[PDB]
């Protein structure tokens, strides 16, 4: 599945700067969900791909940014 990278402490999305293909998001997504994950910059937030069904993505409960 796919979803936004979520900071598990603040509950925020990761803002990114270069829309579309983005190494920063690829790197941040793999670091959170594993080396098999992908990710790119979408509406200026990291959107992670190839996630296992159970992976925790935005939004987290009661963790508002």
């Amino acid at each position: 599945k796919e979803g936004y990278l979520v900071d598990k402490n603040t509950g925020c999305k990761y803002e990114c700067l270069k829309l579309g293909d983005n190494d920063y998001c690829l790197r941040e997504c793999k670091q959170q969900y594993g080396k098999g994950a992908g990710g790119y910059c979408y509406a200026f937030a990291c959107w992670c791909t190839h996630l296992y069904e159970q992976a925790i993505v935005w939004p987290l409960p009661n963790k508002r940014c």
Partner: antibody
Amino acid sequence: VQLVESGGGLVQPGGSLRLSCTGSGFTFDNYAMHWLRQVPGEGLEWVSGISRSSGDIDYADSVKGRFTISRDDAKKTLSLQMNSLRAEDTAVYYCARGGVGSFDTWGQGTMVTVSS
Amino acid sequence: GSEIVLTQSPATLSVSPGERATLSCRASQSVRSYLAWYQQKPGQAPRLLFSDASNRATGIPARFTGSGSGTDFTLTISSLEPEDFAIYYCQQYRYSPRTFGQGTKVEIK
């Protein structure tokens, strides 16, 4: 939550100027930061921005190669190195906090004037 | 590359307090929901009004409402207070670079 910017002033075409922005009232580390600008009496234009940990950076086409953005998270500051200035760069320059697509907090603005 | 064009109408809106103000923002093509709104009083820096089509920024009164998705966005000020006379700018963020409308000046009638 407040932003404060400095280092604006007068300059000559081809000249250089370095702006600086200081954040207070929030965890500077956690936020993407941006420079935007506004020609007096005209509309807004995004200039440049930098992500958490300085891991992603970008610039508006009109400014790519001439400007260089950077941050220092210990000092809670954001910088803009302006080079090879032109008449177009004449504007109020705003520092702003990223709101994931939008800009939720703006400083007061510092004026940059390039003649002729 | 091309840039999303945002067309705000009317350029100038005459309204008296207590009346309802309706602002439009139209995009050259669909930006889905990634449409922010700003307010700017003279000599002042802009402030965030909406972060996307319908999400009010913190501190903004519920008299302001945004709606729309795709190409046609509306900002509605239900019962205009005098402090609401300002310039309103729309801004898209689906595509790069981000772009802004040319603004709608809300003046008193």
